[PDB]
């Protein structure tokens, strides 16, 4: 059976990728940052699957994956690079440089040790590489519509102005470095590159250890009734669809060299609260109602059109109601 390497296999998205791979009986090697984490994955979370791990402690080290492909370079046909460096005042030193090292490094390892073996590389990017936050608020401007061809317009310099733009810029330049390496090495290496650009990722955890894997959801379910409502707005996507897209991206020829925008629709804090309160009557004594029916995302956000991605992937995404229901019902069951 074909071996698939998944970096950062303990992560929220990555565990769903490994789960869905093992559901299809792939042989999987995951990278983990410690032996303890790897043993937990192999002996507990993914017991029953053909799962092994390699220890890769620092994603920001550009040589971090050299040993993986020196030892396994004849076997790994598929690379799903979902890991990113840990997320300061020095945005350049602590975010931007680690990001470009953290994405291009594994591609260098493949070129050095497995150039004619790896067939497909899928890299987890972000909607942050499609648009800076500064450009996300041109409401109803169809000329501003963000698509898979859109790139974050901040520069290496201008994104260092604040930590939000800096983080978003780190995602932009990580993905750009992948493409620039790829286009400069397409003769030196066999693999074909594809990209996944998730928006805000919600959804249930693969394995439960009111603490969801989404900081947006966590903020909402920890709100007091009197509390100031935080400002959240953007696109949502269920982690299970994000993972499914990673797998289809290496299996189907039409997904080669695509940037696949994993985006199921728009939300604001108010639309999330409306759905949570509607789906969870049990929580109505705890969380605020806000002002139901207000905060229409179409009136807040630059339009987003990922019709191309949806047609290429060919399956309908989990909607926000089911996403939040599965996320929060898992959380409540875990409070037993």
């Amino acid at each position: 059976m074909t071996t698939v390497f998944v970096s950062g296999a303990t992560g929220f998205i990555a565990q769903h990728v490994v789960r869905q791979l093992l559901d299809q009986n792939y042989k999987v090697i995951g990278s983990v940052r410690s032996a303890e984490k790897g043993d937990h994955l192999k002996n507990v979370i993914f017991k029953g699957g053909d799962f092994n791990y390699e220890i890769v402690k620092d994603i920001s080290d550009p040589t971090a994956f050299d040993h993986v492909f020196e030892k396994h370079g004849k076997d790994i046909k598929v690379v799903l690079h979902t890991a990113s460096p840990f997320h300061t005042t020095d945005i350049e030193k602590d975010l931007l440089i680690p990001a470009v090292n953290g994405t291009k490094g594994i591609l260098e390892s493949i070129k050095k040790y497995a150039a004619q073996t790896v067939e497909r590389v899928v890299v987890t990017s972000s909607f942050a590489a499609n648009t800076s936050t500064v450009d996300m608020f041109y409401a109803k401007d169809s000329s501003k519509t963000i698509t898979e061809e859109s790139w974050n317009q901040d520069t290496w310099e201008s994104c260092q102005s604040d930590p939000i733009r800096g983080y978003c810029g780190s995602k932009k330049f990580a993905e750009k470095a992948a493409w620039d390496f790829y286009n400069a090495n397409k003769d030196s290496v066999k693999f074909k590159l594809s990209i996944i650009n998730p928006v805000y990722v919600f959804g249930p955890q693969n394995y439960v250890e009111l603490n969801t894997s989404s900081e947006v959801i966590n903020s909402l379910v920890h709100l007091k009734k009197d509390d100031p409502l935080p400002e959240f707005a953007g696109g949502h996507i269920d982690v299970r669809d994000v993972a499914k897209a990673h797998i289809l991206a290496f299996q189907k020829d039409e997904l080669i060299e695509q940037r696949l925008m994993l985006h199921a629709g728009l939300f604001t804090t108010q639309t999330l609260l409306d759905i949570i309160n509607e789906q969870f009557p049990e929580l109505k004594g705890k969380i605020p109602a806000g002002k139901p029916g207000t905060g229409n995302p179409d009136d807040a956000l630059t339009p987003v059109d990922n019709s191309k991605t949806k047609k290429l992937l060919g399956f309908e995404f989990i909607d926000l109601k089911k996403d939040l229901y599965d996320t929060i019902s898992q959380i409540l069951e875990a409070e037993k």
Side-chain angles (χ1 to χ4, degrees), residues 189-210:
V189 298
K190 178 189 230 176
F191 69 79
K192 306 286 184 181
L193 178 67
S194 303
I195 302 296
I196 311 303
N197 302 92
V199 292
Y200 288 93
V201 183
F202 305 154
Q205 300 170 342
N206 173 67
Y207 187 92
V208 56
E209 300 292 350
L210 306 152

Side-chain angles (χ1 to χ4, degrees), residues 23-125:
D23 292 342
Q24 284 179 47
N25 283 111
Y26 282 92
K27 185 181 307 279
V28 177
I29 302 177
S31 86
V32 293
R33 290 190 192 110
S34 76
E36 171 156 359
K37 276 167 118 187
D39 287 342
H40 187 55
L41 290 196
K42 182 177 181 195
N43 297 329
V44 176
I45 299 197
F46 298 124
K47 168 152 180 179
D50 186 349
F51 177 89
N52 283 280
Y53 65 90
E54 285 296 339
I55 304 167
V56 177
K57 311 191 89 66
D58 185 1
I59 310 301
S60 70
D61 181 351
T63 68
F65 295 93
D66 281 353
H67 179 52
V68 163
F69 291 92
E70 175 167 36
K71 168 141 78 70
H72 292 281
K74 310 175 295 187
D75 298 326
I76 297 169
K77 285 189 180 72
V78 180
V79 173
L80 306 180
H81 183 39
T82 76
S84 50
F86 278 108
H87 171 27
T88 185
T89 69
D90 208 335
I91 287 168
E92 177 177 71
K93 191 159 66 76
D94 293 350
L95 281 180
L96 300 180
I97 291 295
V100 301
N101 276 342
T103 296
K104 180 269 187 168
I106 186 164
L107 309 181
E108 190 70 56
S109 297
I110 293 167
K111 176 184 165 180
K112 288 200 287 195
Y113 301 104
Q116 302 307 321
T117 300
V118 176
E119 301 170 359
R120 304 287 276 267
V121 172
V122 184
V123 175
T124 315
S125 178

Side-chain angles (χ1 to χ4, degrees), residues 159-312:
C159 78
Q160 301 178 41
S161 58
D162 69 76
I164 294 178
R165 273 179 105 180
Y167 179 69
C168 287
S170 80
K171 297 307 231 249
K172 176 196 170 165
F173 290 107
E175 191 194 328
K176 173 177 173 59
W179 286 112
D180 286 341
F181 177 95
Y182 181 67
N183 287 323
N185 286 282
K186 276 153 98 164
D187 312 329
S188 307
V189 298
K190 178 189 230 176
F191 69 79
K192 306 286 184 181
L193 178 67
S194 303
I195 302 296
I196 311 303
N197 302 92
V199 292
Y200 288 93
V201 183
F202 305 154
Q205 300 170 342
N206 173 67
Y207 187 92
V208 56
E209 300 292 350
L210 306 152
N211 180 33
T212 78
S213 282
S214 162
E215 73 199 19
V216 174
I217 308 302
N218 291 349
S219 301
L220 292 204
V221 301
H222 298 119
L223 281 172
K224 305 173 179 49
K225 273 250 183 222
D226 69 84
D227 258 353
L229 301 195
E231 278 301 316
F232 292 119
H236 62 88
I237 186 73
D238 194 290
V239 65
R240 291 165 290 181
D241 292 330
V242 175
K244 188 171 292 302
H246 279 79
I247 291 164
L248 291 166
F250 77 86
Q251 291 172 332
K252 304 221 176 150
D253 281 0
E254 59 270 26
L255 303 185
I256 290 168
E257 285 166 4
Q258 301 298 325
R259 303 175 84 204
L260 300 167
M261 190 191 293
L262 262 283
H263 162 86
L266 298 171
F267 74 90
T268 63
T269 296
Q270 188 62 56
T271 72
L272 299 180
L273 289 174
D274 287 1
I275 291 161
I276 296 171
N277 279 310
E278 198 251 332
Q279 291 295 297
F280 294 95
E282 327 84 285
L283 295 183
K284 274 157 77 74
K286 173 176 156 61
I287 68 162
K291 317 191 208 299
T294 67
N296 165 27
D298 291 325
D299 295 331
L301 293 155
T302 304
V304 173
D305 180 350
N306 68 332
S307 51
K308 178 177 173 172
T309 297
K310 298 190 283 181
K311 186 170 159 227
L312 287 166

